[PDB]
Amino acid sequence: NSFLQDVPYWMLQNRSEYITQGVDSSHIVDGKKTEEIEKIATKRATIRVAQNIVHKLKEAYLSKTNRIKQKITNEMFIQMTQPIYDSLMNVDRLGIYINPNNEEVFALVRARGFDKDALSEGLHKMSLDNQAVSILVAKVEEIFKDSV
Amino acid sequence: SFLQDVPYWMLQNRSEYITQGVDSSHIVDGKKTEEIEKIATKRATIRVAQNIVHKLKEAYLSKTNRIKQKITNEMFIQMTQPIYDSLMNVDRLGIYINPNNEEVFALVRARGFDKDALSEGLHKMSLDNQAVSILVAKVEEIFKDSV
């Protein structure tokens, strides 16, 4: 009953709770080279960090210390994923890992920052009031500074 | 931050047993966990097929190979279908969801296969008689050596 070998520690962890760090995979599409399945896995991972940020935001919203009075529907929160992803910058691929069982590529990624203008603008197009946007931007702002 | 309840099998290369396979499926909208589990299970079952093809391709490319007919890679790949088709009594030994990305993994093992099924399927594929006989023989071995 031999166990897998050469398995990075980050794979044994729940990185998605660093919020700015996301892990995701991609099955090896046949017609593609490993290098490309890594591209796909990396995008997914960075999208994941976006979702991580949204999940953190949705948490604070549903928190009892939430100051946002506008109603933000579950669907809206999913919408936020896009503007947030759009604003991410300086995203490093910290690692890759391929599981032998099914040849699936995993990628560890970290977004080092985001454009405040970009996020703000994006959130505004989404139909949140000024107060909400200010608070939301203020929060992903803290999520990032508090991530170092 | 270490993942808590990770099954032991998730830490092993289960496709080492050939008749066992592990594969996954990403979570998906409109889809409940229950059916992403169904999807992962089928992919895992296909792995078993793939594991079996991979094992045959090994013996075919080994020194002790007796199949004189040449079998291309595209052929070996298509050998997957008939093998999968013939699988029977496939049990789902486990399910594991990775918190990092809500991806469902599934562990399965095919307890058997139908000689007739595989044979017929292999013949349709364009292998000579001796080729089929040997391959079906080898797949027999694979399953007995997994008990």
Author numbering:
A (entry chain A): 34 to 181
B (entry chain B): 35 to 181
Which of the paper's sentences describe this entry?
Here we report the crystal structure of the N-terminal-truncated Tipα starting from the residue Cys25 (TipαN25) that retains both inter-molecular disulfide bridges. Our TipαN25 is always dimer independent of pH values or protein concentrations under non-reductive conditions. In the crystal structure, TipαN25 adopts an intrinsic dimeric organization as the active unit, which features two flexible disulfide bonds at the N-terminus linking two monomers of the unit to form a tweezer-like configuration. A homodimer, linked by inter-subunit disulfide bonds at the N-terminus, is present in an asymmetric unit. Two subunits of a TipαN25 homodimer related by a local twofold axis are arranged in an anti-parallelly way to form a unique shoulder-to-shoulder dimeric mode. The N-terminal loops (25–33), where the two inter-chain disulfide bonds are located are structurally flexible and not visible in the experimental electron density map, implying their nature of intrinsic flexibility. Tethered by flexible disulfide bonds at the N-terminus, two subunits of TipαN25 are assembled in an almost anti-parallel shoulder-to-shoulder mode with the dimer interface mainly mediated through β sheets. The whole structure of TipαN25 homodimer resembles the shape of a pair of tongs, with the disulfide bridges as pivot and a pair of anti-parallel β sheets as jaws of the tongs to clip targets for its functional performances. The dimer interface buries a contact area of 4813.3Å2, reaching 30% of the total accessible surface area, which is primarily contributed by β sheets.
Tipα, therefore, is an important pathogenic effector of H. pylori that promotes host inflammation and tumor progression. Tipα is secreted as homodimer by H. pylori independent of the type IV secretion system. The active form of Tipα can bind the gastric epithelial cells and subsequently be translocated into the cytoplasm.
